[PDB]
């Protein structure tokens, strides 16, 4: 009675800063084939393979809009943006990016919020008003990005007897217009923390709309724009100095998350209790893993051969994606 | 290497007062005077627990905190109540609320900053900071609410050094006042995320060791805290004397945890003999060996044999040979190998001192991590959800701003802590 | 030329204490001119052993480089940041000594796999040396772990992550395990109190016969480079087995029939070679024998002959050209508190075999078991490593044991 975790992958286009320096296309982009050739023998399974010239509406209609229909089930649905440092996770969902000419430069977030105001227009039956939150996961500490300052001793999480997670110390603002939504995304992305200048912390944007089941059994539905971090592993040659200390603490949280998600599909040697409690980005995604709640995996890789094994490590992120 | 000291709670003063009996005797220190130890090797790394700001004197780098003054007022009247710089005292004449949250949200909360000024004056007072010793109790709010309030602010302040948690878990039947167990739950809900080492102790274990193995029939509490002073005098500055293979706090931290859940530790001390009756002509490291691993001589509530052994480190104190150490550790790897879980081959961690204590020829220091502590917190769970169901002591905590939703989160977090202990008891 | 070495690691420091002690006794060195090394540790305690009592005045103390931060016995910490503060200072001290010496002969590296201390600091230390002085002699030297007499909880991980890269930056390497030395002190030195410092006098004895006697008056003095050409038929830096044979105590030597063939033959009994992977089936590919004292060649060309004509101690078939012998003149020297019994002739053997890969398997599969539950990942990824580092270590030793495999029985 449980639907499996849907598995998708994205290839980014190649920038001239890696093209002219000789980074050959180690990947084999095969979007319609449902698979991707790496090297000469690595052939992996993916439901939706995204080419390096794909459209954000096609990304929106392959995974997100089928969960937007499933958001009206009154149940959870979660899609993140995974990749290594420099994979384009900013472009993947479409926040902290303001061009808005062709409108394909911004991605899923104005499409799902603009379409969310489109769905307020039709379904005028259920009493519904959406409030969202926009938080930071930084050095295993939280920060209300919608506020210029809030105590870390105040911003803590909760857990009930039903089995959910409640936030505290979080500025919650309802929606009235996509101008207000992009105003909160603008002020929040300005309040986040070079060009990206760290691309470091997790920026978590949770959309919340309870669906009043029909003065009765309340049916809660949440949808999740959880933007992940860069997944540099090897890099002795990258993050140095004090900025070494910025990279190193979240780097343990990365394989903490990978240690969590790989404890489900492999029961071969006493597959023990799932340690969601180890990291603060994992307890917020305990609801985002398994069960009647929905989760679809989308990751962004690089065509550069220098991150080749790292791309395979991203594929190792994707190989153990079962459920 | 430098470490500051913390005594919170009405219990805690004594919790470590006896320690400040011991270690000053370990270096040859008067109540007022100086380094009168005859051996120069009692001096060479005293900076881990000490400073010299009046110069000729000695000062324990220590911060003594209570929410009711008369306890530490009795301490400063004690025999070692003059060796403190009394400006290091931080307290108040507030009502020391027996609520956890009243020491965690209101009373000490307007005394936190007064503590933090002394931890910052004392932290960068001298050379590079090494670790923190948290001596308190869970038996009430005073060591627990202000305790994890302190160190929960401290890890936000200092994300770097080591947090040693001397907790006092209540004994599973010999209670104190039956309002008790909530002062475990909300405390330990905010222990595991804000420490990396927790040496938990248990009361009826103290009566078990003091009352039976030592044949003294009258367990004075100063003798109990004297035994805990033998523990922490066993652990750290023992390694900060010369040692053949001498570890630190950080090595023990990386050793005895599988995971960052850190799986709170259970200490023991080997030579436990009655006073004059135990002429024995068989006292050496070896004895410490079989003495360490029995069901008694354990400061834990549950029987340690009842689960596996994940990691056990030992700190042997005496002029001795590692062949007749590591051979004995091989014996423990053999004769008890069923409950000595297989998939880590070295559950042992050898630690070698060079010095005895003041009178004994040879001692030893047990630090343990079984899986058996599963049936401690489950015990603490089983009482917790028992008289949570009546909701009958709910008003004292609601009246201090603590809300409803916190409790069930604490139940789930300590709950699946117990569940993963079961998942690795195997 | 009177060669200048390094010592990191606590056992490396104390093994230089007794080793360097036997140095500064056997050449007639008074307890008050020239010391010829450096001592590095990530805690000033172990150095403050030597920096306090005896053998304190006999150094110019402006070179005993210490780090007042954590001892930090975990690999990824000791390779990265916590030794990064000190590595440059060590480099400038050793290049200052490189300039002060004239015609430096090589590097012998005393450290340990047994902790993070002499593992990653040693790893990029040797890496930085091969960047600096790659056209030199590199003789790394760690104490190999015990297979079941082990000490650390992370007992694989330091060694496993070390051999990931310490192979590519030295050629000759000597690894000796503790347990059989406990068998020697227990049995053949015949005492039941085996001390760390007595072990240190034993390795200090064998290194005391590697080079200081071989730079003393020897008629068949051997170059250090003749080790790194003789002992390996392949350029893949492998590692032999070294054993000092005359381990009799003071009560034993009312034993007037004691000659070169005795300890010569005793170099080849299997439970004496100071490693717990005895030549049950290890075909020898290389054997350098270094003798000292009044050595008679009759035991040489009768005893070594009947070793090779035993045909029970079978060499490598396809590559059997495995002898290299040199004899010094000077006898060894009695440590005044020591245990060796003033022997008028002595043999330090060494021999690269087949067997060590099995010992590596003793470390390997053990290493896999604690990897099998993803156990200690959070410390090392908490210091700057990842899953792929462990995987490259595992594949690295996986190819290594097959390189040890095909040279032997495969003829
Ligand atoms: C004549 C003689 O040898 O007396 C011994 C003695 O009889 C025995 C029984 C001691 C004695 O300890 C106790 O009776 C005891 C009392 C309360 C709680 C715990 C223990 C002793 O009091 C304790 C004392 O311990 C020390 O001196 C250590 O350095 C110890 N010191 C303290 O605990 C201490 C006590 C008072 C004031 C300051 C310090 C220590 C241990 C570990 C780390 C640091 C210090 C010793 C050897 C003895 C006496 C004096 C009788 C024993 O304990 C210790 C900790 O050594 C109890 O079993 C051991 C075996 C000893 O042989
Ligand atoms: N043979 C021998 N081995 C030793 C001796 N001392 C330590 N060892 C082994 O070496 C391992 C650790 O290597 P060391 O260099 O001595 O210790 P370390 O890593 O420097 O520890 P720290 O000084 O705290 O950093 C231990 O596990 C011991 O098994 C010794 O004196 N002789
Ligand atoms: N699939 C992609 N599509 C369009 N632009 C991309 C893509 N990938 C990378 N880029 C561009 O190249 C740069 C690198 O992307 P970037 O998002 O900064 O890396 P990142 O690791 O994902 N950082 P972050 O999203 O903040 O965690 C950006 O300016 C992108 O516009
Ligand atoms: N070992 C030891 N434990 C004690 C002693 N006195 C009290 N305790 C335990 O510690 C707890 C007291 O903590 P405390 O701060 O004094 O109580 P609170 O003021 O209400 O928080 C009690 O539950 C006792 O079980 C003592 O002298 N020695």
- With beta carbons under 8 A apart, name residues in chain A contacting B308: none
CA distance A260 to chain B (A): 12
Q: Say how far apart CA B18 and CA B206 lie, in whole Å.
A: 15
- Secondary structure of chain B as H, E, C letters: CEEEEEECHHHHHHHHHHHHHHHHHHHCECCCCCECCCCHHHCCCHHHCEECCCCCCCEECEEEEECCHHHHHHHHCCCCCCCCCHHHCEECCCCCCCCCCHHHHHCHHHCHHHHHHHHHHHHCCCCCEEEEEEECCCCCCCCCHHHHHHHHHHHHHCCCCEEEEEEECCCCCCCCCCCCCHHHHHHHHCCCCCCCEEEEECHHHHHHHHHHHCCCCCCCHHHHHHHHHHHHHHHHHHHCCCCCCCCCHHHHHHHCCCCCCCCCEEEEECCCCCCCCCCCCCCCHHHHHHHHCCCCCCCCCCCHHHCCEEEEEEEEECCCCCHHHHHHHHHHHHHCHHHCCCCCCCCEEEEECCCCCCCCCCEEEEEEEECCCHHHHHHHHHHHCCCCCCCCCCHHHHCCCCCCHHHHHHHHHHHHHHHHHHHHHC
CB-neighbour burial class of residue A251 (10 A; exposed 0-12, middle 13-18, buried 19+)? buried
Query: Do A273 and B419 count as a contact with CB atoms less than 8 A apart?
Result: yes
Query: Within a domain: residue A108?
Result: yes
Candidate of B25, B358, B367 to mutate for ligand 1, largest count of ligand atoms within 8 Å of Cβ: B358
In contact, C344 and C331? CB cutoff 8 Å: yes
End-to-end CA distance of chain C: 40
In contact, B339 and B308? CB cutoff 8 Å: yes
- Triad C46, C51, C56: Cα angle to 5°: 140
Q: What is the DSSP letter of C66?
A: B
> Which ligand 4 atom is nearest residue B224's CA?
1
Q: Say how far apart CA C161 and CA C392 lie, in whole Å.
A: 9
Instruction: Residue C222: name the closest of C312, C308, C323, C86 by CA.
Output: C323
Q: Say how far apart CA B67 and CA B65 lie, in whole Å.
A: 7
Can you give the CATH number for the domain in which A229 is found?
A: 3.40.850.10
The total of other beta-carbon atoms located within 10 Å of residue C119's CB is 31
DSSP element (H, E) containing C396 = helix C387-406
The closest CB to that of A275, out of B159, B259, B405, belongs to: B259
CA distances from A313 to A289, B357, B400, C77 (A): 21, 53, 50, 23
Pocket of ligand 3 contains residue A196 by CB under 6 Å: yes
The total of other beta-carbon atoms located within 10 Å of residue B190's CB is 22
Instruction: Residue B251: name the closest of C383, A252, C375, C70 by CA.
Output: C70
Quick one: fold of B373-426?
Answer: Helix Hairpins (1.10.287)
Instruction: Residue A144: name the closest of A99, A192, A194 by CA.
Output: A192
Question: What's chain C's length in residues?
Answer: 411
CA distance A240 to chain C (A): 10
Taken in order C297, C300, C303, C308, is the CA torsion positive or negative?
negative
Q: Say how far apart CA B367 and CA B293 lie, in whole Å.
A: 11
CA distances from C226 to B394, C243, C288 (A): 82, 18, 10
- Sequence ranges of the binding site of C: 9-11, 14, 43, 71, 112, 115-118, 151, 155, 178, 196, 200, 224
* Torsion angle in degrees (nearest 10) through CA of C208, C209, C215, C220: 180
- Helices and strands in chain A: count of H runs, count of E runs: 9, 12
Pocket of ligand 2 contains residue C117 by CB under 6 Å: yes
Q: In 3-state terms, what secondary structure has residue C399?
A: helix
DSSP element (H, E) containing C371 = helix C356-371
- Resolution, rounded to a tenth of an Å? 4.2
> Which ligand 2 atom is nearest residue C15's CA?
31
Query: Within a domain: residue A48?
Result: yes
Pocket of ligand 4 contains residue B315 by CB under 6 Å: no
The closest CB to that of A248, out of C372, C373, C384, belongs to: C384
In contact, B19 and B232? CB cutoff 8 Å: yes
Q: What is the DSSP letter of A277?
A: G
What distance in angstroms lies between residue C86's CA and the mean position of ligand 2's atoms?
Answer: 20
Instruction: Residue C147: name the closest of C352, C376, C355, C367 by CA.
Output: C367
| Any B CB within 8 A of A242 CB | no
Q: Say how far apart CA A297 and CA A82 lie, in whole Å.
A: 8
Q: Say how far apart CA B314 and CA B352 lie, in whole Å.
A: 8
Query: Within a domain: residue A1?
Result: no
Closest Cα to atom 29 of ligand 3 = A88
What distance in angstroms lies between residue C192's CA and the mean position of ligand 1's atoms?
Answer: 29
Q: Say how far apart CA B108 and CA B121 lie, in whole Å.
A: 19
Pocket of ligand 2 contains residue C152 by CB under 6 Å: yes
Q: Domain ranges for chain B, please list them.
A: 1-258, 259-372, 373-426
The total of other beta-carbon atoms located within 10 Å of residue B218's CB is 7
Quick one: fold of B1-258?
Answer: Rossmann fold (3.40.50)
In contact, C207 and C19? CB cutoff 8 Å: yes
In contact, B261 and C82? CB cutoff 8 Å: no
- Would residue C311 be called left, alpha or beta, if left means φ above 0 and alpha means ψ between -120 and 50 degrees? left
Taken in order C110, C116, C119, C120, is the CA torsion positive or negative?
negative
What distance in angstroms lies between residue B257's CA and the mean position of ligand 4's atoms?
Answer: 28
Bridge partners of residue A10, in order along the sequence: A50, A300
The total of other beta-carbon atoms located within 10 Å of residue C61's CB is 11
Instruction: Residue A248: name the closest of A257, A240, A258, A237 by CA.
Output: A240
- Secondary structure of C136-190 as H, E, C letters: CCEEEEEECCCCCCCCCCCHHHHHHHHHCCCHHHCCEEEEECCHHHHHHHHHHCC
In contact, C153 and B311? CB cutoff 8 Å: yes
Q: Say how far apart CA A148 and CA C25 lie, in whole Å.
A: 71
Q: Say how far apart CA C64 and CA C82 lie, in whole Å.
A: 18
C386 is catalytic: no
Closest Cα to atom 31 of ligand 2 = C196
Task: Tell me how many residue pairs between chain B and chain C have CB atoms under 8 A apart.
Answer: 96
Q: What is the DSSP letter of A278?
A: G
Quick one: fold of B259-372?
Answer: 60s Ribosomal Protein L30; Chain: A; (3.30.1330)
Query: Within a domain: residue A143?
Result: yes
Q: Say how far apart CA A1 and CA C32 lie, in whole Å.
A: 84
Pocket of ligand 1 contains residue B359 by CB under 6 Å: yes
Query: Do A233 and C387 count as a contact with CB atoms less than 8 A apart?
Result: yes
User: Strands, E, within chain A: which ranges?
Assistant: 6-11, 27-28, 35-38, 42-45, 48-50, 77-83, 131-138, 141-144, 173-174, 202-212, 218-227, 294-301
Bridge partners of residue C326, in order along the sequence: C290
Which residues numbered 294-323 in A keep a CB inside 8 Å of some CB on C?
Answer: 309-310, 313, 316
Pocket of ligand 1 contains residue B107 by CB under 6 Å: no
Q: Say how far apart CA B194 and CA A141 lie, in whole Å.
A: 12
* Torsion angle in degrees (nearest 10) through CA of A256, A262, A263, A265: 170
- Triad A63, A69, A71: Cα angle to 5°: 95
In contact, B265 and B197? CB cutoff 8 Å: yes
Instruction: Residue C387: name the closest of A320, A10, A297 by CA.
Output: A320
Q: How was this structure determined?
A: cryo-EM
Instruction: Residue A68: name the closest of A115, A30, A2 by CA.
Output: A115
The total of other beta-carbon atoms located within 10 Å of residue C99's CB is 9
The closest CB to that of B416, out of A160, A166, A273, belongs to: A273
DSSP element (H, E) containing C243 = strand C241-244
- Those chains having 3 or more beta-carbon pairs within 8 angstroms of chain B are A, C
- Would residue A60 be called left, alpha or beta, if left means φ above 0 and alpha means ψ between -120 and 50 degrees? alpha
Query: Do B321 and C150 count as a contact with CB atoms less than 8 A apart?
Result: no
- Phi then psi for residue B260, to 5 deg, are -75, 10
Instruction: Residue B47: name the closest of C180, C45, C24 by CA.
Output: C45
In contact, A279 and A140? CB cutoff 8 Å: yes
CA distance B86 to chain A (A): 30
In contact, C174 and C139? CB cutoff 8 Å: yes
In contact, C284 and C322? CB cutoff 8 Å: yes
The distance of Cα A44 from the centroid of its chain, to the nearest Å, equals 22
Catalytic residue among C2, C85, C226, C395: C226
Pairing of strands B309-317, B348-352: parallel
- In chain C, the domains with their CATH numbers are 1-240 (3.40.50.1440), 241-355 (3.30.1330.20), 356-411 (1.10.287.600)
CA distances from B113 to B120, B347, C368 (A): 10, 42, 49
Candidate of B360, B361, B362, B364 to mutate for ligand 1, largest count of ligand atoms within 8 Å of Cβ: B360
Q: What is the DSSP letter of A149?
A: -
The total of other beta-carbon atoms located within 10 Å of residue A156's CB is 18
Q: By residue range, what is the domain housing residue A116?
A: 6-319
Q: Say how far apart CA C127 and CA C87 lie, in whole Å.
A: 12
CA distance C214 to chain B (A): 31
Query: Within a domain: residue A199?
Result: yes
| DSSP one-letter string for C268-312 | SSGGGSSSSS-TTS--B-EEEEEEEES--HHHIIIIIHHHHTTSS
Q: What is the DSSP letter of A238?
A: S
Query: Within a domain: residue A233?
Result: yes
The strands making up B197-201's β-sheet, listed across from edge to edge, are B90-91, B62-66, B2-7, B129-135, B162-168, B197-201
Instruction: Residue C354: name the closest of C303, C395, C403, C304 by CA.
Output: C403
Pairing of strands B2-7, B129-135: parallel
Instruction: Residue A146: name the closest of A132, A156, A157 by CA.
Output: A132
- Those chains having 3 or more beta-carbon pairs within 8 angstroms of chain C are A, B
What's the domain count of chain A?
Answer: 1
């Amino acid at each position: 009675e449980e639907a499996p975790v849907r598995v998708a992958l994205r290839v980014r286009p190649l920038l001239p800063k890696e093209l002219l320096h000789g980074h050959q296309s180690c990947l084999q982009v095969e979007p319609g084939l449902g698979r991707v050739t790496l090297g000469r023998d690595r052939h992996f399974g993916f439901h939706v393979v995204l080419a390096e010239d794909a459209g954000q509406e096609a990304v929106y209609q392959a995974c997100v809009q089928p969960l937007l229909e499933a958001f009206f089930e009154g149940f959870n649905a979660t899609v993140f943006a995974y990749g290594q440092t420099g994979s384009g996770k900013t472009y993947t969902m479409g926040e902290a990016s303001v061009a808005s000419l062709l409108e394909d430069e911004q991605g899923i977030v104005p499409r799902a919020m603009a379409e969310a105001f489109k769905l307020i227009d039709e379904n005028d039956l259920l009493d519904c008003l959406v409030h969202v939150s926009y938080l930071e996961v930084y050095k295993e500490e939280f920060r209300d990005l919608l506020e210029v300052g809030t105590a870390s001793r105040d911003i803590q999480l909760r857990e009930d007897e039903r089995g959910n997670v409640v936030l505290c110390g979080v500025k919650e603002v309802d929606v009235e217009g996509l101008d207000e939504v992009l105003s909160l995304l603008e002020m929040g992305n300005a309040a986040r923390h070079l060009n990206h200048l760290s691309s470091r912390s997790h920026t978590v944007f949770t959309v919340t709309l309870e669906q009043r089941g029909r003065p009765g059994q309340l049916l809660v539905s949440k949808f999740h724009f959880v933007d992940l971090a860069g997944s540099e592993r090897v890099l002795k040659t990258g993050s140095t100095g004090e900025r070494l200390k910025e990279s190193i603490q979240i780097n343990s949280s990365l394989l903490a998350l990978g240690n969590v998600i790989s404890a489900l599909g492999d029961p071969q040697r006493r597959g023990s209790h799932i340690p969601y409690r180890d990291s603060k980005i994992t307890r917020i995604l305990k609801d985002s893993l398994g069960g009647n709640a929905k989760t679809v995996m989308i990751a962004c890789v690089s065509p550069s051969s220098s991150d080749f094994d790292e791309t395979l490590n991203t594929l190792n992120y994707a190989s153990r994606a079962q459920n | 290497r430098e470490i500051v000291h913390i005594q919170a709670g009405q219990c805690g003063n004594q919790i470590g007062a006896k320690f400040w009996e011991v270690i000053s005797d370990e270096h040859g220190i008067d109540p007022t005077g100086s380094y009168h130890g005859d051996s120069d090797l009692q001096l060479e790394r005293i900076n881990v627990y000490y400073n010299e700001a009046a110069g000729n004197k000695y000062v324990p780098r220590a911060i003594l905190v209570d929410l009711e003054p008369g306890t530490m007022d009795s301490v400063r009247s004690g025999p070692f109540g003059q060796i403190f710089r009394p400006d290091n005292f931080v307290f108040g004449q507030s009502g020391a609320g027996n609520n956890w949250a009243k020491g965690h949200y209101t009373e000490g909360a307007e005394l936190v900053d007064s503590v933090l000024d002394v931890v910052r004056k004392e932290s960068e007072s001298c050379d590079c900071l090494q670790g923190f010793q948290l001596t308190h109790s869970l038996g009430g709010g005073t060591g627990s609410g202000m305790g994890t309030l302190l160190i929960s602010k401290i890890r936000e302040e200092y994300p770097d050094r080591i947090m040693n948690t001397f907790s006092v878990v209540p004994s599973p039947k010999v209670s104190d006042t039956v309002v008790e167990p909530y002062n475990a739950t909300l405390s330990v809900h905010q222990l595991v995320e804000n420490t990396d080492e927790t040496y938990c102790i248990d009361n009826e274990a103290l009566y078990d060791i003091c009352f039976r193995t030592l044949k003294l029939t009258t367990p004075t509490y100063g003798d109990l805290n004297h035994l805990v002073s033998a523990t922490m005098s066993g652990v750290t500055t023992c390694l900060r004397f010369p040692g053949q293979l001498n570890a630190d706090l950080r090595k023990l931290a990386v050793n005895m945890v599988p995971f960052p859940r850190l799986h709170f530790f259970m200490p023991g001390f080997a030579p436990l003999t009655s006073r004059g009756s135990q002429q024995y002509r068989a006292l050496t490291v070896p004895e410490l060996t079989q003495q360490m691993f029995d069901a008694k001589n354990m400061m834990a509530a549950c029987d340690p044999r009842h689960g596996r052994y994940l990691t056990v480190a030992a700190v042997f104190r005496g002029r001795m040979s590692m062949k007749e150490v590591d051979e004995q550790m091989l014996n423990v790897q053999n004769k008890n190998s069923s409950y000595f879980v297989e998939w880590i081959p070295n559950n042992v961690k050898t630690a070698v001192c060079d010095i005895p204590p003041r009178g004994l020829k040879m001692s030893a220091t047990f630090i343990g991590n079984s899986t058996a502590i599963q049936e401690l917190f489950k015990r603490i769970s089983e009482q917790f959800t028992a008289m949570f169901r009546r909701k009958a002591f709910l008003h004292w905590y609601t009246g201090e701003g603590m809300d409803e939703m916190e409790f069930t989160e604490a139940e789930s977090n300590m709950n699946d802590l117990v569940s993963e202990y079961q998942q690795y008891q195997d | 030329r009177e060669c200048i070495s390094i010592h990191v690691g606590q056992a490396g420091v104390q093994i230089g204490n007794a080793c360097w002690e036997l140095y500064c006794l056997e050449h007639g060195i008074q307890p008050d001119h020239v010391p010829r090394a450096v001592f590095v540790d990530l805690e000033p305690t172990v150095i403050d052993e030597v920096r306090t009592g005896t053998y304190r005045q006999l150094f110019h103390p402006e070179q005993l480089i210490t780090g007042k931060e954590d001892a930090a016995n975990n690999y990824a910490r000791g390779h990265y940041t916590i030794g990064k503060e000190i590595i440059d200072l060590v480099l400038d001290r050793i290049r200052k000594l490189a300039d002060q010496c004239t015609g430096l002969q090589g590097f012998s590296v005393f450290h340990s796999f047994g902790g993070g201390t002499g593992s990653g600091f040693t790893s990029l230390l040797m890496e930085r040396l091969s960047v600096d002085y790659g056209k030199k002699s590199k003789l790394e030297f760690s104490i190999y772990p015990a297979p079941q007499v082990s000490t650390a909880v992370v007992e694989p991980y330091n060694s496993i992550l070390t051999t990931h890269t310490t192979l590519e930056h030295s050629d000759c390497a000597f690894m000796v395990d503790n347990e059989a030395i406990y068998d020697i002190c227990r049995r053949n030195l015949d005492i039941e109190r085996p001390t760390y410092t007595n072990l240190n006098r034993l390795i200090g004895q064998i290194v005391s016969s590697i080079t200081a006697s071989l730079r003393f008056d020897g008629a068949l003095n051997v170059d250090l480079t003749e080790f790194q050409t003789n002992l390996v038929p392949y350029p893949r830096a492998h590692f032999p087995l070294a054993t000092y044979a005359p381990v009799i105590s003071a009560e034993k030597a009312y034993h007037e029939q004691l000659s070169v063939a005795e300890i010569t033959n005793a170099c080849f009994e299997p439970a004496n070679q100071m490693v717990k992977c005895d030549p049950r089936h290890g075909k020898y590919m290389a054997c350098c024998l270094l003798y000292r004292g009044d050595v008679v060649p009759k035991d040489v060309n009768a005893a070594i002959a009947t070793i090779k004509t035993k045909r029970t101690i079978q060499f490598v078939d396809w590559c059997p050209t495995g002898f290299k012998v040199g004899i010094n003149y000077e006898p060894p020297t009695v440590v005044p508190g020591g245990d060796l019994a003033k022997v008028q002739r002595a043999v330090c053997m060494l021999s690269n075999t087949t067997a060590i890969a099995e010992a590596w398997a003793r470390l390997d599969h053990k290493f896999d078991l604690m990897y099998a539950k993803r156990a200690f990942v959070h410390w090392y990824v908490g210091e700057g490593m990842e899953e792929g580092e462990f995987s490259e270590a595992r594949e690295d030793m996986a190819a290594l044991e097959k390189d040890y495999e095909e040279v032997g029985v495969d003829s």
